[PDB]
Structure 1
């Protein structure tokens, strides 16, 4: 089953293409190839600085009639410096303009924390701490709801929200639209059982980011754990005549998660999509879950004192 039903009534492809770190001179081809080989979901963000180039690909494939717009599921995210009532619509509109779209399928609050507006994505004080905004996650959520009512987005959701932050949203006085998705880091070294069960219990679909462990993250260190090189995961892959990446992508799929592996390599884009013709056993699944080490690749010291930093 290639799509999962969201609490807004729309269906979301369980496999998408990630675009963080995809170079602007490679991402247009990456997205073109992805659509040609079957991808229907692209995960984007304004902070990734490549939405224009992603958009060139989407638009060309729509113009070529490779795909219809209704068949695509395009996701983007509101950056931290736009949490303000008066900035949310324009931030969404910039993303739409760049992506060459008239609506998004899903728009996420990228991180729960708001930062001081301005040119800089991470405004810092003189001692290196991020400069917060005073706007909370409830007022930012109201601004997201307006986007649904204005036709700019079909669904809204959240990303990197912890259990208490999700609960805050769900308990919002006058809540109009529930979050459809919570997009969080998830892989065998950070299995997220507690947060996933909470979200799923509330009808919120979870998307797993960095499912391969983000080996290209800029802050990687040579001796960090490596999922793709873990011999235990290689052994499960060999047993199934699949690659390690294919196992790492199928794993979240069988947990009823959406998953968004990134690649700019055409052969790997195609490889990564060939995950609908095999099944991990229950024993395989439990074995992969057993590798949890609470190892989080996406975290940021400069933001750890923000009142809404999620990983405290």
Structure 2
């Protein structure tokens, strides 16, 4: 189990990163500092998480402390939906760079395929309760992303929450300059993503698994929803290995040649979650975890389902 995976820009990406969605500004500096200390090099960020400044402070601290150097870190951020217009993309990237306090990003993703009305509000809604879209399209937004590579702001570009047809649209774009390096998608034992993973990997696109613990802290969760972390079948596998359920849920995608980005703001759990390089799930464990798929996704909004580019109408 090598700790990094080769990307199609020639760079190497650490397979275990720290998620930062819902880590509040007042606590995330400590979280990221602890993460870097215990071995995390990959940090998953986004402008919409509204904590990039404080992630950036942790990075600056660890550089100053001589704990890491910039080139050892793999910092990912994402273009929010309200900035899909070609003319807004560079400024959005620069804002993220200013907040993270970096010269460049290792990877910059189109966060969702759906463009939203530009403006101050991140989730502009109309009187029907649906998001107000923008007059933007995947291919033009991709071209703007490509310019960021040529301008040296980012080392690689990729996508997130794109279905296979949306990926294909980019792969077949006339005059394509860069293929997506990564597609970051929800993936865990209840949403194993076998078809989309098969598709992306065959194209040399690395898949990052988000919400690997089932995002129990998501806001819009339903009392009548699942709980991976409490699934006794998964705890049974953990117990066999003298590990925790979270550790099993993190190791699982690692053994599928995926990158994985579990989130914690808690020092003890940040450290726990990185202790997954000293054991292996058996081939039976792997097959068994795959059998738990129920095609249940937690990251999707009713308010986005009428968007022309909503990704989850398609099977995969």
TM-score computed with the length of structure 1 as normaliser = 0.99
- Deviation (angstroms), 1:123: 1.2
1:226 aligned partner: 227
Taking the aligned partners of 2:111 and 2:80, their CA distance within structure 1 comes to 6
Supply the distance in 2 between the matched residues of 1:43 and 1:147 (Cα, whole angstroms): 19
Q: CA deviation at 1:224?
A: 1.7
Work out whether 1:244 is the aligned partner of 2:237: no
1:139-167 per-position Cα deviation (integer Å, ceiling 9, x unaligned): 00000000000000000000000010000
CA distance in 2, matches of 1:132, 1:19: 26
The one-character-per-residue Cα deviations of 1:172-191 (angstroms, maximum 9, x if unpaired) are 11100000000000000000
> Following the alignment from structure 1 to structure 2, what is the Cα–Cα distance between the partners of residues 145 and 224?
39
Gaps of 5+ in 1: none
Whole-angstrom distance in 2 between the partners of 1:114 and 1:209:
21
Runs of 4+ in 1 over 6 A off after TM superposition: none
Q: Deviations over 1:182-209 (max 9, x none)?
A: 0000000000000000000000000000
CA offset digits 1:71-104 (Å, max 9, x no partner): 0000000000000011000000000000000000
Q: Deviations over 1:223-244 (max 9, x none)?
A: 4211110000000001111110
Following the alignment from structure 2 to structure 1, what is the Cα–Cα distance between the partners of residues 248 and 86? 42
Mapped partners of 2:277, 2:37: distance in 1: 17
Following superposition, the deviation at residue 23 of structure 1 comes to 1.1
List alignment gaps of at least 5 residues for structure 2.
none
CA RMSD of aligned residues (A): 0.6
Show CA shifts across 1:259-303 (max 9, x none): 000001100000000001111111110100000011101000111
- Give 1:222 deviation, angstroms: 3.0
Instruction: State the SS of the aligned residue for 2:108.
Output: strand
Instruction: Name the CA distance, whole Å, in 2 between partners of 1:282 and 1:2.
Output: 20
CA drift at 1:124: 1.4
Deviation per CA, 1:111-137: give whole Å up to 9, x if none: 000011000111112221111111100
Aligned length, in residue pairs: 312
Taking structure 2 as the reference length, what is the TM-score of the superposition?
0.98
